[PDB]
């Protein structure tokens, strides 16, 4: 099925564990379209006795109501959460005050201990192909990290000193060694975060089509210059044209990630 787990992912866990002490605060990036399935229990087990905040990046592509409901669900769960758009600063201004409020206890303890306040050390962690580096570049305004439109761009963790106020640690995305629930794997593959040359694209397209038919029948109706909802997939595939028998699957997955359709969420 989906098994992608190279060696740099394995080394990332060891490096994070070996450099855990210096960390003051943790930011855990989670995609808004799939807030529950995008969490990583494997890295969460390592991460404990540390305050953290949930971040919902790529929030422009998801439905506002479901994202806000998920924000409430995280908030009353017992963890702080926020909705952010990395490409254009939407909620980026309200994270430094949150970090200050969270760490104020240790800050005042140290201040009364007799030392000058120092910079906040933050570690950014999450699954690949989420705004782990674009957010850093926006926060530093410098364009210092390398970004790309495919998973697996960065390969080594790096320190970034944002002024005299923040010390950020970046990290390559991490995936659990073995999947358990196939629906989560399908959703992850749809959203990206996988090399896409290791998986079966036809099953991804089938899942997308059936989810669309179940949830957004009107958006499926408008589609791209065709209006039908038959039982099979071959009706829509041969819209615009030997023609590609099923390579059009890529087309089906090509536009959706670019939001040719309207905003949607899978939850």
């Amino acid at each position: 099925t989906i098994q992608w787990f190279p060696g740099h992912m394995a080394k990332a866990r060891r490096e994070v564990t070996e450099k855990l002490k210096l960390i003051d605060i943790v930011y855990e990036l989670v995609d808004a379209r799939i807030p529950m399935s995008s969490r990583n229990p494997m890295i969460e087990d390592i991460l404990k006795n540390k305050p953290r905040i949930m971040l919902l990046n790529k929030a422009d592509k998801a439905d506002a109501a479901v994202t806000q409901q998920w924000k409430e669900h995280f908030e009353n769960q017992g963890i702080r959460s926020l909705s952010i758009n990395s490409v254009n600063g939407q909620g980026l201004n309200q994270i430094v005050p949150a970090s200050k409020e969270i760490l104020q206890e240790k800050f005042d303890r140290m201040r009364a201990k007799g030392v000058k306040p120092r910079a906040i050390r933050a570690l950014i962690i999450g699954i690949p192909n989420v705004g782990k580096s674009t957010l850093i570049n926006r926060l530093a305004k410098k364009n210092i990290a390398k970004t790309g439109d495919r998973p697996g761009i960065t390969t080594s963790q790096q320190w970034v000193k944002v002024g005299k106020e923040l010390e950020l640690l970046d990290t390559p995305g991490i995936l659990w060694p073995k999947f358990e629930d196939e629906l989560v794997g399908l959703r992850l593959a749809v959203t990206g975060a996988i090399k896409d040359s290791i998986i079966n694209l036809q099953d991804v397209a089938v899942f997308g089509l059936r989810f669309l038919e179940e949830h957004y029948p009107e958006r499926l109706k408008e589609r791209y210059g065709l209006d039908e909802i038959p039982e099979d997939i071959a009706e829509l595939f041969d819209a615009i044209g030997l023609i590609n028998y099923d390579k059009t699957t890529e087309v089906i997955i090509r536009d959706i990630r670019t939001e040719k359709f309207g905003r949607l969420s899978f939850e």
Binding site: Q202, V206, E231, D232, I233, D246
Partner: peptide, 9 residues
């Protein structure tokens, strides 16, 4: 075929 007894993969 997308629908049938057996599936791709």
């Amino acid at each position: 075929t997308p629908g049938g007894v057996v599936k791709k993969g």
